[PDB]
Design a protein around this ligand. Structure first.
Ligand SMILES: *[C@@H]1O[C@H](CO)[C@@H](O)[C@H](O)[C@H]1NC(C)=O
Ligand SMILES: *[C@@H]1O[C@H](CO)[C@@H](O)[C@H](O)[C@H]1NC(C)=O
Ligand SMILES: *[C@@H]1O[C@H](CO)[C@@H](O)[C@H](O)[C@H]1NC(C)=O
Ligand SMILES: *[C@@H]1O[C@H](CO)[C@@H](O)[C@H](O)[C@H]1NC(C)=O
Lengths: 434, 434
């Protein structure tokens, strides 16, 4: 037998269902989303960190003018100064006091402590959720991990589970993200080659140890104003440091739908943003014949102090009478109230209490003790507590959320208005035929 | 100096331009696309090959029965055979001739030659184009590589050029591709875990050496008929070899805009499909003063035997009245005709010749001989050769594709009909005032 149903993406919060077969007994169906993960397909655009702005020794030639050729090093800024008189310790460094040439060289490199402190720029594509499911059908508890794609038959034991395509995906990661020390940022980093100075991506490379290092940080070499040797240079502030100053908050503190963000690999776990269409191929071994199932005669609901809340507020007792011994499932067919229990060992002519939760002010739903569908009615008071530490077990649907007294009052006013309108029109009609 | 232009994406057939400042004279601009490549972002979604379907030794236990536990091996299928009596060399194997048990196991595994004969199933996303550009200005020729995103400063030794966003990338690779032995295919392979027997992807892994191999080939174990110790099994045929049977043609042979597909990395080179906006910053070291540039006083043009074709057919001769020896550029200011040469040596009051190609029967265009403009008129013939081995240097527009003689006849008829209608209406006007 194949049962196709729809489960909310909330972690925990067990989902009830009834499996009714024409040739077998109804079966309790439990579906719990124990965990989920939204893993995007990512690629490494580049990696960046603080630079080193290492400066080589100046090249001095005296009565001779020399030029410097191009180099493949990042930020290869090279300047030529004439008329310099270099002077280290001991004495003047050379001769030709009026005619010299000092060559000053500058090029950036990754800082030595960039193996730890480095930001990797990733491009994020579409993400496919992988859901961890637990099914407690017919005293058989199967734990499985399956992909939400609609084509993958991934399940354990003889059970088979296909999770259909998700109702809607929101992609918490933007198309460009930045990962640093386990922190994820939705930052629009510049592309490879596109390199603003003094901001993020000022120095780039394909890998940390890659020799193809590129940068466009503004290095300006200046003429030495003191009669010594050195390379005076003005440089833009490190854009990695400026980004770390103004990084904002990581995605772990701003992800919608309560997504908990991890890296290696990048993923969003324990999200809740929609409904999974799931098809389950239940084995025939767990199914029990209707002849062996106790066919129950008559039941009735009597509710005791129901409170509509996120908690299991409300305990109703069922008055039943059954032909023989044996257990049978319980289920609430309405999508408004949920029942805590799933199987009771009913015996004969007694009463069993069950705790239930609901959201609507009025509790009209269907209890299916041994499959005996019975409509149950109750009046529930608003909860006294304001904030609760556990999530709601059912979503409002805005048709039963209107209370019975309010429903009756609205239909009373519209019925009275329509009645006076119709009697006005029929007075017009009978005056017209006169 | 920022010059904005829009060059064709076609490799070869170089693009001519004239850059003219207010006061630093005209200068040539020779923009050549020597190479291009589309390198899309891909991720390994699985790898597949033939399976070995290694069958382990049977486990025969007697005077009893045993069951086998499920394993994590790829496509594990195990069965229990009752009432066997094996005969390998030496006679019967054990006691309870009527009560025996044979345990048969079967699982698949990559073939020993899967290191080469393997198909990598990849998901492909949007691609970024990268151009090799040969830019000639003055006497300087520079070769330089630029990404096509409008943001990346592709630079020569001294040049700053930006390749703007492409008109419309066509993406020859679909969302799913398969790479085998250097041949790529646009194949809609099943996802991870979505195995089916007798089709591509029936065995899957993240790598050739990955232990987590999963497969769902239709394998079944059968009861042995002859009383020996073999394991009779029957399995569905390998969908890898079935896919190689009818893979169709690779993308190297079936690709729009006819461009060469390579692997490692997966790229599409020399794809002529559009127009690249180019904003180039010409250095001022080549912008000569207008006074030093030898200007001309009187310019006249003629043309002999214009043949419109992809080849540079047509010789156009200019009579000039220059005042100084030197050289200065030439350019055609029509999108319909393009000149062969860029700069011409000019002495004084002489005659020069140029070659050009056009796609219109009429050649009504503008030659800018060394600063100023001069119009030229012609009537070009269709070429004798039906097929030429080189692409066209210009496109076709509806205004130029109609010949001057045909333009005359068509407007002669249209204007005759229109003026005939207007003269009918004015005869109506003079009759109505009567
Ligand atoms: C299912 O579980 C209940 C509670 O443990 C047990 O008493 C009952 O016999 C079980 N039903 C079957 C059919 O095994
Ligand atoms: C950024 O740096 C400035 C100093 O320039 C400092 O005052 C400030 O706290 C830093 N952080 C933010 C978020 O502005
Ligand atoms: C370019 O070269 C020509 C001849 O090749 C020479 O006469 C001239 O000096 C050069 N002009 C410029 C502007 O570089
Ligand atoms: C497929 O393999 C069969 C052999 O069974 C062969 O006859 C046939 O030509 C192959 N190709 C196609 C397209 O069927």
């Amino acid at each position: 037998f194949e049962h196709a149903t729809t489960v909310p993406n909330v972690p925990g919060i067990p989902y009830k269902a009834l499996v009714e077969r024409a040739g077998y007994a109804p079966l309790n169906l439990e579906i719990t989303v124990v965990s989920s993960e939204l893993t995007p397909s990512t690629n490494k655009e580049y990696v960046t960190c603080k630079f080193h702005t290492v400066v080589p020794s100046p090249q001095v030639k005296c009565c001779g003018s020399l030029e410097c050729k191009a180099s493949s090093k990042a930020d290869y800024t090279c300047r030529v100064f004439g008329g310099v008189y270099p002077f280290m310790w001991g004495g003047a460094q050379c001769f030709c006091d009026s005619e010299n040439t000092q060559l000053s060289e500058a090029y950036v490199e990754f800082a030595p402590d960039c193996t730890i402190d480095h930001a990797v720029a990733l491009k994020v594509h579409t993400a496919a959720l992988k859901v961890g499911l637990r099914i407690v059908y017919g005293n058989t508890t199967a734990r499985l991990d399956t992909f939400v794609n609609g084509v993958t038959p991934g399940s354990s034991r003889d059970l088979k589970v296909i999770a259909g395509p998700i109702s809607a995906a929101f992609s918490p990661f933007d198309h460009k993200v930045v990962i640093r020390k386990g922190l994820v940022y939705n930052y629009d980093f510049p592309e490879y080659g596109a390199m603003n100075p003094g901001a993020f991506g000022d120095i780039q490379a394909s890998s940390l140890d890659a020799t193809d290092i590129v940068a466009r940080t503004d290095i300006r070499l200046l003429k030495p104003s003191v009669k010594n040797i050195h390379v005076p240079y003005t440089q833009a502030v490190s854009g990695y440091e400026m980004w770390k100053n103004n990084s904002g908050r990581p995605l772990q503190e701003t992800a919608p739908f309560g997504c908990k963000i991890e890296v290696e690999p990048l993923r969003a776990t324990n999200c809740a943003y929609g409904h999974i269409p799931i098809s389950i191929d239940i084995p025939d071994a767990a199914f029990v014949r209707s002849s062996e199932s106790p066919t129950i005669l008559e039941v009735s609901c009597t509710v005791a102090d129901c409170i509509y809340s996120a908690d299991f507020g409300g305990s109703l007792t069922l008055q039943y009478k059954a032909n023989r011994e044996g257990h049978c499932p319980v289920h609430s067919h309405s999508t408004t109230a949920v029942l805590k229990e799933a199987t009771t060992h009913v015996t004969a002519t007694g009463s069993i209490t069950l705790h239930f939760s609901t959201s609507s002010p009025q509790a009209n739903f269907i209890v299916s003790l041994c499959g005996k569908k019975t409509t149950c009615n109750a009046e529930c008071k608003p909860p006294a507590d304001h904030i609760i530490g556990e999530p709601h077990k059912v979503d409002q649907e805005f048709q039963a959320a209107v209370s019975k007294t309010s429903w009756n009052w609205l239909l009373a006013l519209f019925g009275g208005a329509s009645s006076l309108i119709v009697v006005g029109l029929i007075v017009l009609v009978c005056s017209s035929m006169l």
